[PDB]
Enzyme design. Structure first.
Site: not given
Ligand SMILES: [Ca+2]
Ligand SMILES: [Ca+2]
Ligand SMILES: [Ca+2]
Ligand SMILES: [Ca+2]
Lengths: 642, 642
Positions: B152, B164, B335, B447, B621
């Site tokens: 959950n 759910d 990040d 990355d 950004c």
């Protein structure tokens, strides 16, 4: 394995080549600007392919062939043999501009090929094979592979002192020296550093003195390179058994490292890894051949010693007699000590778990590994630990049997063996433990109500269950036969004043109700055993037992529990019950003989209580039998995952 | 399953019979002393067999048949249907002595048969099937079974609030009431109590109000029995993902307990168990369809926002714009946030991991589950976490791809992502993580040097690698072409005074050496990626990159790293490099187009740096793309053991 090595624009590249890999080589970056084509030469022991956008063509040592310079046109460089001092292993690339056929520049690659392999016996035959392709994995089963480590249970050194550890060999082949800026380093993870230790002779010229190079606080060791064809011998030890947080697997790595510059980490240009699994501790069921019988008692319990010695003389076993100690219970050989073993393909030995009542201050001799525990209830005793014979349950085989541990019901709030010990037994995995219900007993030991015996002349076995119903049936028969006044505890002077007879037992209403309840407890266990061991009623014999209830509603033996017996193949030492005498024979002894003897089991009744003059439910002696290990190798099992 | 129930000498036994079991019944113990034979009667819905030493014969409801009383002659008692109010289910045994044919005594067994089954969707179709024979196990693979629980991730209740969670149904059938002295109890272990929670309507007559009956501090719940054919509906939730000490498996039990007496534990006469596995957190690779693009930047970085919006307008994706926050870095959407998902057969949703720089004080909306971390280096950033497309490596398929994490060399003493996060990713198991080498970068994120892109119109993909060698080659060509004076960073006013040209870069000797070294770092990664992802050179494209070295000998971008790009299928947002201008086009942009465009990839260059007037190696950004989950169901994978 493919490895990247680029030619350096204008400047010669020197590299170590490790056999078992190959290089892909960019020739385009070292090309002068404006260069159009390239050609190459190479030495005899270097194989070179030009690979154009995936298509590879082998190239001659000295050709004149030219190819268009492209980022997608590369070299593949392979070597099948290690360099020697006679080697000059090289590849030279010449570059051409559009105009002329004379090279405008050249970039070389000078190679030194070496063989480096960290080798272990991953095929489990006791010999360390050359570079087993599977050595970096560990798989279970008959077809499974990967190397096995023994825990060091005894705890600068000599090769003899390391005799029983596992061997790991670094095999190398190459020229007199590694090129400048390389070294070879053996290493392990911080996490594994308390699981293993590794020994090595650091300075063989000064002797063979093995030192501890990897382990606690030592995570890496630089190993000296020897030219030619060479082997470095390492000995490896496990430091602990599998447990709650430890699967039993450890890794050891060797890397060829390249020096870059000062303050820059060294580059791992080649790494080889071996995996070990630490062998689990395994318990021996009553069906395995006895080797030695250990007993403990007070010095003056003469009948016990005489009768146990007589029993053992019927067998090929040896007897080992131990007395009482200040720090131990009267049953300690049974309660505080458990005989088990570990095995590796090369070797194995017996390993005793020791859990002293008051702690250690002792040994069964040098043949044994010894493992001692670092509050507790009586369920923590090894009297509360048993193991079944091999069984198959709904198609799943348990070739080593299954460990049985007494407990209470989940919602009961009752006693339970400590999690530490339960987790240890579970982590060994090969005995797939089962919890029974022992907590209805004052002492709380599974060995109070159950045991296993082999059926002589077969591969089969029986579960023996204590039964109060069997006892009441028998006593009711003898009473109807006119034996109601038959007295128990004959010859125990301290019981005499109680004048306990069959009539007096049968007329005790509350004792009847208590024992019906205990029979329900026994039957609950019967059902779990039949389910988890795959047993039917034809596999079970009930022996008469009787209990008295305490203030906690828990049971203690009214007369000695006959189920807890010394099993040596066909011969059974059975606690003497001191039951009602009919025609001058104990009716309990006669009943038990009538159950067991027809199966070829030979019964000897052993008196452990006479020396004390009475029986209050406590037994002051203990026995334990050391047995031969299973013939089935544990590593051939395939345990369920998780 | 066989269960022991003994007749009681002289006295009627009443017992609950649970369908799916059968009874073995001792008739010998209840026999009066001296009795010889026995006969039996039974009701219509009870089946009785006399079992003599293993041989079983079915017996009529009222026969006159007699059998010799023996301990080895027993009854087997079976029932195939639950009792109702019209039932009288019984077995009566009469005993005879040697003399007469009139019974001397009788012992009965009165039975109430009930059906009790704790049911889950173990066949993974979203519907809770009746008593799946495999519900007590959990196995991986296409043929595998056992039920799945979702954590959950949003965190008296209502049925909608539980919508759910996983369903678990206790199905019973029987008469109006349980016989006296029985109750039904649902329970879990102490260990599982922080892994799960269970909700139930305790008082349905007063409404449907679901209360939390099992979980932290609640280990058991007594459930009320309803007669006839009945179902109790429970909703089950996972409280946490698999982790270092938690495999992901939990158990729930129901037992029928029998009251014995006061102060005596209740006896578990029947227990049924279901197992759940908590669904792992799964990461989405760049090849999966984009749904939403999230970006963060300062409010005034207009070109970035305009150009990102333009890119997204080329697609069917939606754009979500976020600004900067006090507690977060300038890249936080990249990040501090990672988009992943969880799936159960019935449902699934996206789940974001959040690791705020300064901690939480924010949300992407209600569609998402949210998971926030409870010192740290820059390697802990999700910029340092990537996942590959599905691959097959030496015959082993990784249908969900493999997670990639930047690290340092084992012996380096360098930075490493925290063990907590590494252990979490490993514990999910289905993405089989691999460590790369990111620690040669100042920021230390995978990355910065690598990415994946799909090859349009196929099922294939490419690895994109930053390459300094590619850049130097390109710059050397342009210089030879007479473009040496071409200037970089055009339009960034704060770079102008540096007057950086291709000549000035190429003449910088130390920068050349630094970048050769960085290329070695890139190539070390290239090799690990090719090995662990099963890639060849035809799967890789190099993009030009250039770095400057800091005092730690670590790299930062000289010009923006183009590899870290927004991948939306065929359309790629690529950081604008601000490279040397030749014929009024950036030679870096033109080179990258020439690499990618022929493959059908469409390139859009995105300027994130102009608003700041200069580039020092930092980007202000970030973007992140939410993607559709894999079509392959994670539970169909078969991960390696351990
Ligand atoms: Ca071998
Ligand atoms: Ca034992
Ligand atoms: Ca289903
Ligand atoms: Ca990421």
């Amino acid at each position: 394995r493919e490895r990247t090595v680029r030619l350096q624009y204008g400047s010669r590249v020197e590299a170590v080549y490790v056999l078992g890999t190959y290089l892909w080589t960019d020739v385009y970056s070292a090309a002068p600007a404006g260069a159009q084509t390239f050609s190459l030469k190479h030495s005899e022991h270097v194989w070179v392919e030009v690979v154009r956008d995936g298509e590879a063509e082998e190239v001659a040592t000295n050709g004149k062939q030219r190819w268009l310079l492209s980022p997608s046109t590369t070299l593949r460089v392979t070597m099948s043999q290690a360099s020697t001092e006679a080697s000059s292993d090289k590849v030279t690339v010449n570059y051409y501009d559009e105009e002329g056929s004379i090279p405008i520049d050249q970039a070389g690659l000078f190679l030194t090929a070496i063989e480096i392999s960290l080798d272990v016996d991953a095929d489990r035959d006791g010999v360390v094979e050359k570079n087993n392709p599977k050595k970096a994995s560990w798989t279970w089963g008959p077809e499974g592979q990967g190397a096995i480590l023994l825990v060091n249970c005894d705890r600068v050194y000599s090769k003899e002192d390391l005799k029983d550890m596992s061997q790991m060999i670094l095999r190398t082949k190459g020229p007199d020296r590694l090129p400048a800026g390389y070294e070879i380093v053996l290493y392990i993870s911080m996490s594994d550093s308390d699981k293993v230790g590794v020994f090595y002779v650091e300075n063989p010229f000064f002797g063979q003195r093995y030192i501890h190079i990897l382990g606690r606080r030592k995570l890496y060791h630089v190993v000296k390179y020897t030219g030619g064809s060479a082997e470095l011998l390492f000995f490896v030890e496990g430091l602990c058994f599998p447990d709650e947080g430890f699967s039993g697997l450890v890794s050891i790595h060797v890397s060829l490292l390249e020096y870059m510059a000062q303050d820059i980490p060294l580059t791992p240009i080649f790494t080889d890894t071996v995996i070990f699994r630490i062998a689990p501790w395994i318990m021996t069921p009553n069906i395995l051949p006895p080797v030695s019988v250990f007993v403990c008692c007070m010095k003056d319990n003469y009948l016990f010693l005489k009768e146990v010695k007589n029993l053992v003389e019927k067998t090929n076993c040896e007897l080992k007699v131990c007395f009482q100690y200040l720090n131990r219970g009267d049953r300690w050989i049974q309660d505080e000590i458990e005989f088990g073993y570990i095995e590796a393909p090369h070797k194995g030995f017996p390993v005793v778990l020791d859990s002293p009542r008051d702690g250690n201050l002792e040994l069964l001799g040098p043949d044994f590994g010894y493992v001692t525990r670092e509050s507790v209830t009586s369920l923590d005793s090894f009297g509360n630990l048993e193991v079944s014979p091999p069984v198959t349950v709904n198609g799943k085989t348990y070739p080593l049997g299954r460990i049985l541990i007494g407990s209470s019901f989940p919602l009961s709030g009752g006693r339970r063996m400590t999690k530490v010990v339960r987790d240890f037994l579970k982590a060994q995995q090969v005995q797939a433990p089962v919890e029974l219900y022992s907590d209805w007993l004052t002492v709380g030991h599974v060995d109070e109500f159950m045991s296993f015996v082999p059926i002589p002349g077969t591969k089969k076995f029986l579960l023996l269950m204590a039964s109060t119903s069997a006892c009441y049936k028998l006593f009711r028969e003898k009473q109807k036969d006119g034996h109601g006044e038959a007295i128990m505890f004959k010859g125990l002077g301290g019981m005499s004043s109680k004048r306990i007879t069959i009539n007096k037992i049968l007329s005790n209403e509350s004792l009847v109700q208590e024992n019906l309840y205990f029979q329900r407890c026994l039957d609950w266990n019967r059902d779990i055993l039949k389910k988890e061991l795959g047993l039917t009623e034809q596999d079970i014999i009930d022996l008469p037992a009787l209990f008295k209830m305490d203030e906690d509603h828990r049971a203690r033996a009214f007369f000695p529990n006959m189920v807890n017996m010394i099993v040596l193949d066909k011969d059974l030492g059975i606690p003497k019950p001191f039951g009602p005498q009919v025609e001058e024979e104990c009716c309990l002894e006669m009943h038990v003989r009538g159950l067991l003897e027809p199966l070829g089991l030979e019964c000897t009744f052993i008196d452990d209580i006479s020396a004390y003059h009475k029986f209050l439910g406590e037994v002051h002696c203990g026995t334990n039998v050391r047995r031969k290990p299973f013939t089935f190798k544990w590593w051939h099992m395939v345990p369920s995952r998780r």
